[PDB]
Amino acid sequence: RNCTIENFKREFFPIVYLIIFFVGVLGNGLSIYVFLQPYKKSTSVNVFMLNLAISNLLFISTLPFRADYYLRGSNWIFGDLACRIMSYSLYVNMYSSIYFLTVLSVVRYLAMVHPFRVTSIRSAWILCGIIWILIMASSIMLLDSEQNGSVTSCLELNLYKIAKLQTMNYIALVVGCLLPFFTLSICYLLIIRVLLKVEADLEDNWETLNDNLKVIEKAAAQVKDALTKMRAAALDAQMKDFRHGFDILVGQIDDALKLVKEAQAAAEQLKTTRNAYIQKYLVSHRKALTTIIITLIIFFLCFLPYHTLRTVHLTTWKVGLCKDRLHKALVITLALAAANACFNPLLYYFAGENFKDRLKSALRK
Numbered sequence: 626r627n628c629t630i631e632n633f634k635r636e637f638f639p640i641v642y643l644i645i646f647f648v649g650v651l652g653n654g655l656s657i658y659v660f661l662q663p664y665k666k667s668t669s670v671n672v673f674m675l676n677l678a679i680s681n682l683l684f685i686s687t688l689p690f691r692a693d694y695y696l697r698g699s700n701w702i703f704g705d706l707a708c709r710i711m712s713y714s715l716y717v718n719m720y721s722s723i724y725f726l727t728v729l730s731v732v733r734y735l736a737m738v739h740p741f742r743v744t745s746i747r748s749a750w751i752l753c754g755i756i757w758i759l760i761m762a763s764s765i766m767l768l769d770s771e772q773n774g775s776v777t778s779c780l781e782l783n784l785y786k787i788a789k790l791q792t793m794n795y796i797a798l799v800v801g802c803l804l805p806f807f808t809l810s811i812c813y814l815l816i817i818r819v820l821l822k823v824e825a826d827l828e829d830n831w832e833t834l835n836d837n838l839k840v841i842e843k844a845a846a847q848v849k850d851a852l853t854k855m856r857a858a859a860l861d862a863q864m865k866d867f868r869h870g871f872d873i874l875v876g877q878i879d880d881a882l883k884l885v886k887e888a889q890a891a892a893e894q895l896k897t898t899r900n901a902y903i904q905k906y907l908v909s910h911r912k913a914l915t916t917i918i919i920t921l922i923i924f925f926l927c928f929l930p931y932h933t934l935r936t937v938h939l940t941t942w943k944v945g946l947c948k949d950r951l952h953k954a955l956v957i958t959l960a961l962a963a964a965n966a967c968f969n970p971l972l973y974y975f976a977g978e979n980f981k982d983r984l985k986s987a988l989r990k
């Protein structure tokens with residue numbers, strides 16, 4: 626090991642791996658504890674988040690061993706099977722995470738489309754199981770093949786595996802990184818488009834309501850006229866129960882008129898119900914937009930630099946050449962990719978589904 630990158634590695638990896646370990650145990654242990662708290666309602670997004678956190682915490686449990694490897698001067702003492710498992714756990718976590726994130730963004734988009742619409746929980750579990758099976762079967766090759774002599778080396782690129790990984794990169798790069806990032810980019814576009822259009826419509830709706838209510842507030846002959854115009858507009862607008870409730874408000878006001886204080890007072894009750902109708906949409910859009918922005922940032926930080934540098938490192942690799950500068954850049958972006966496993970609970974906190982509700986419930990206990 627003549628190259629200087631090895632001296633860099635033996636100090637750098639123990640630091641970042643142990644930081645990720647402790648931070649990731651705290652975050653994921655607490656997140657999983659919160660998830661499993663009983664709450665009157667549950668959702669498929671809770672399924673996807675729980676699967677992500679379990680995957681991340683499993684991966685995090687391997688990091689003290691990798692740190693040990695480097696702290697011993699790059700000598701593996703944990704046996705051949707354990708080395709195999711290091712490799713396998715790294716890559717299974719990474720791509721299961723990428724797919725759980727992609728599915729989560731898609732789900733939030735599809736939800737913001739339908740704010741008023743167990744059945745989908747079992748489907749969420751079925752989908753998770755599909756993802757696990759496909760990635761675990763695609764990764765078993767790592768389990769097939771501690772190599773070194775006079776010392777025991779694990780975690781190292783070497784001649785024996787170079788051609789193999791050159792082929793596998795090709796697939797994982799395309800199907801495991803770039804295709805999901807493409808899916809995310811379309812999801813961002815669609816989220817922004819739908820959000821802008823819906824909120825423009827909602828502002829128009831609220832504005833016309835306040836116009837009609839200001840007319841009723843100012844000026845009984847014209848009160849009935851305004852209420853009948855509003856009733857006709859509402860009838861043409863036909864959420865059957867919601868429309869019926871608003872129309873019953875209108876009919877109660879129009880009766881209290883046709884029977885000036887009671888009807889004008891009843892006119893205000895539409896305002897709070899309309900504000901609640903607006904807020905339902907606004908909450909769905911907040912959630913979808915937060916999810917997609919945090920997820921794109923994770924991809925730009927954790928996954929795309931790593932896959933880029935990894936690919937070039939493999940393509941230019943030669944037996945008797947160090948390439949210490951490219952190799953150092955790769956080591957750093959590998960740390961970032963690993964660190965995703967402690968970054969993800971940010972998403973549970975800022976875009977969870979009754980996450981804070983479950984947390985406040987836990988705090989009561």
Ligand SMILES: O=C(O)CCCN1C[C@@H](C(=O)O)Oc2c(NC(=O)c3ccc(OCCCCc4cc(F)ccc4Cl)cc3)cccc21
Binds near residue numbers: 712
């Ligand atoms: O420390 C250091 O000096 C630096 C790192 C050395 N080092 C250590 C070495 C090591 O791991 O020991 O790895 C590299 C790789 N590895 C790959 O380029 C790879 C490519 C593909 C791959 O596939 C796993 C299974 C993916 C299954 C899958 C999931 C999907 F979602 C979609 C499609 C598929 Cl197919 C694994 C590694 C590339 C460059 C260097 C190293």
Ligand SMILES: CC(C)CCC[C@@H](C)[C@H]1CC[C@H]2[C@@H]3CC=C4C[C@@H](O)CC[C@]4(C)[C@H]3CC[C@]12C
Binds near residue numbers: 809810814817818921
């Ligand atoms: C992942 C990164 C690269 C995404 C950046 C892509 C840019 C080009 C995206 C982000 C938001 C997108 C816009 C979102 C909304 C609309 C309104 C629609 O009526 C025409 C397209 C238009 C104007 C989109 C054009 C493309 C767009 C500007």
Ligand SMILES: CCCCCCCC/C=C\CCCCCCCC(=O)OC[C@H](O)CO
Binds near residue numbers: 803806811814
């Ligand atoms: C909504 C905005 C539009 C969404 C789109 C934004 C995200 C693009 C995603 C993937 C493209 C990846 C393209 C990478 C192509 C590289 C091909 C290449 O460089 O090949 C090198 C060499 O020729 C081979 O051996």
Ligand SMILES: CCCCCCCC/C=C\CCCCCCCC(=O)O
Binds near residue numbers: 679714750753
């Ligand atoms: C992530 C580090 C390496 C992990 C290797 C694979 C471990 C799998 C662990 C947990 C997956 C949980 C499986 C639950 C999904 C099945 C649901 C169903 O079939 O209905």
Ligand SMILES: CCCCCCCC/C=C\CCCCCCCC(=O)O
Binds near residue numbers: 821
């Ligand atoms: C990673 C993100 C890439 C940045 C893409 C830049 C394009 C952003 C375009 C529009 C952002 C719109 C923000 C939402 C405005 C809401 C205001 C309103 O609805 O009244």
Ligand SMILES: CCCCCCCC/C=C\CCCCCCCC(=O)O
Binds near residue numbers: 919922923968971975
């Ligand atoms: C967003 C970065 C993801 C990974 C980087 C880790 C460090 C980030 C630390 C703090 C970021 C906080 C982002 C909060 C977004 C929520 C905004 C909102 O609630 O509307």
Ligand SMILES: CCCCCCCC/C=C\CCCCCCCC(=O)O
Binds near residue numbers: 987988990
């Ligand atoms: C809940 C996070 C609040 C942050 C406070 C900082 C210190 C907290 C650290 C560890 C507390 C561990 C909480 C686990 C105990 C179970 C919770 C309960 O009592 O219901």
